[PDB]
């Protein structure tokens, strides 16, 4: 029964391993193994549940084990395994073949098979851990082994993509351990993890690997959010080492998502407004990306309300995610109408929900934005309005209070008006008629730059796949 179960799943794993083995042996092609590894994550997730854990036991028996002798026993010890007589030395798939990792040349140590085996061995370990959700000692045991192994290898062009996806599981397993249970050992454990990120990033800077650095930057910027250091994030993004060429679309959306939250504390939303919009256009619409589209839209509504301008109202109802976007609608309504008591009761009921996404602090600063937006609304209605006429609307305190809040709104060039105290009314200095100025000419220059930007990229993207069809023989 259990004998035929191990031969079926292992043959499918070797069949996929032999495909990428001959691709890296001929010259240098870095895109051939990458296409299979994308589907390998989905195929292995469903395959690990079937036939239990016995598919990876004989895989260690097949290939020679440099480090893996005691790693499979410690993984099966936590589950209190039963002895099926799976002891190595029974199932042999090698049988002295060149593609089978011939044993005699391997045992004599005249050839090195460890490069394409041991590096691939760590990949299958992290896949089974994410399915069973194992924590505590099993997380630290794997992280301690991989770090010296990566420093011993030279990290060739094809070797940089093997561990590129392993860093995502290292950071994920460490964060889920701290949120589940907090202790004093978890704090000092992250200290070593912060040093390991910078040591490997410096090595990958020489190879200029596009996918490797794309995964690191996403994990490094996210670690600064929990650590709470802006100087580490500000100096990191100043180098601009992130390639835009071969990185995946899912990795691009995560990059622009961090720049929106970093620039949000600098009180400059001009650049941050583009990063949050570009992150949505680069994020897939599938179900696996719904978690990112949910968090990205929550930040988009908060950026516009902090700019003094009301965002698009139809964005809530047209989308199907508005169930979680309902609290943000009451925030926009309270700022636009200008009611002081409505804003206090708005954030009170949802105060518990605003703590998870850490957007409650941005909601506290909306208290002043209620008046900032209310002044712009009443200014467009009345070009010349008296001093006591505004207090009768928003129910402000005194007449001197409303007079000094308008002078602050013109600091950034929002209202663009003047206050005449001798006459007793506030007059708007904006006559429009900007068609006679040079201001629209500056915006029109960027539209030509944006049009010709995609023209050069059009020749690069379309012509590249036609290179292989010329050399290949056709009928």
């Amino acid at each position: 029964l259990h004998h035929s179960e191990k031969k079926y799943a292992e043959e499918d794993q070797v069949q996929e391993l032999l495909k990428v083995l001959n691709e890296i042996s001929k010259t240098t092609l870095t895109l051939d193994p990458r296409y299979i590894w994308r589907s390998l994550k989905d195929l292995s997730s469903l395959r690990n549940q079937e036939l239990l854990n016995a598919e990876t036991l004989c895989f260690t028996v097949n290939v020679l084990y440099p480090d893996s002798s005691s790693f499979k026993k410690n993984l099966l010890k936590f589950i209190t395994s039963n002895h099926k007589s799976s002891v190595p030395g029974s199932a042999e798939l090698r049988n002295s073949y060149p593609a089978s990792f011939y044993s005699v040349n391997t045992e004599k140590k005249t050839i090195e098979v460890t490069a394409e085996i041991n590096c691939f061995m760590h990949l299958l370990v992290q896949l089974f851990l994410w399915d069973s959700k194992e924590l505590e000692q099993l997380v630290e045991f794997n992280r301690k082994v991989v770090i010296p192994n990566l420093l011993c290898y030279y990290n060739l062009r094809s070797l940089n993509l093997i561990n590129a996806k392993l860093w995502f599981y290292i950071y994920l397993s460490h964060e889920t351990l701290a949120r589940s249970s907090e202790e004093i050992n978890s704090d000092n454990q992250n200290i070593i993890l912060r040093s390991t990120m910078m040591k490997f990033l410096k090595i990958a800077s020489l190879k200029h690997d596009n996918e490797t650095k794309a995964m690191l930057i996403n994990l490094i910027l996210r670690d600064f959010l929990n650590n709470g250091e802006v100087d580490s994030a500000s100096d990191f993004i100043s180098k601009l080492e992130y390639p835009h060429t071969d990185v995946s679309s899912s990795l691009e959306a995560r990059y622009f998502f961090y720049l929106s939250k970093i620039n949000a504390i600098q009180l400059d939303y001009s650049t941050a407004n583009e990063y949050i919009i570009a992150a949505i256009r680069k994020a897939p619409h599938n179900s696996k990306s719904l978690g990112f589209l949910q968090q990205s839209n929550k930040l988009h509504c908060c950026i516009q309300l902090l700019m003094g301008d009301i965002p698009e109202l139809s964005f809530f109802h047209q989308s199907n995610m508005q169930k979680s976007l309902l609290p943000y609608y009451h925030l926009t309504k309270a700022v636009k109408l200008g009611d002081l008591k409505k804003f206090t009761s708005t954030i009170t009921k949802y105060k518990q929900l605003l703590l998870k996404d850490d957007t409650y602090q941005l909601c506290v600063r909306l208290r002043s934005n209620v008046i900032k937006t209310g002044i712009r609304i009443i200014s467009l209605t009345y070009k010349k309005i008296s001093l006591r006429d505004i207090c009768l609307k928003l129910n402000l305190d005194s007449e001197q209070t409303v007079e000094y809040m308008v002078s602050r709104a013109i600091r950034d060039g929002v209202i663009e008006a003047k206050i005449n105290h001798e006459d007793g009314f506030i007059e708007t200095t904006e006559l429009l008629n900007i068609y006679d100025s040079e201001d629209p000419q500056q915006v029109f220059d960027e539209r030509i730059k944006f049009a010709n930007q995609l023209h050069d990229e059009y020749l690069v993207s379309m012509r590249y796949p036609e290179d292989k069809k010329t050399q290949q023989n056709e009928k």
């Binding site: 698009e312 109202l313 109802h317």
Partner: peptide, 27 residues
């Protein structure tokens, strides 16, 4: 649905009939 169906109206209901009060009295 730009600036219309999202906020609806929620006005000009009982205040519309109340306008005829000042029209038929002060006049």
């Amino acid at each position: 649905e730009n600036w219309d169906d999202v906020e609806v109206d929620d006005d000009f209901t009982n205040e519309l009939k109340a306008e005829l009060d000042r029209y038929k009295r002060e006049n």
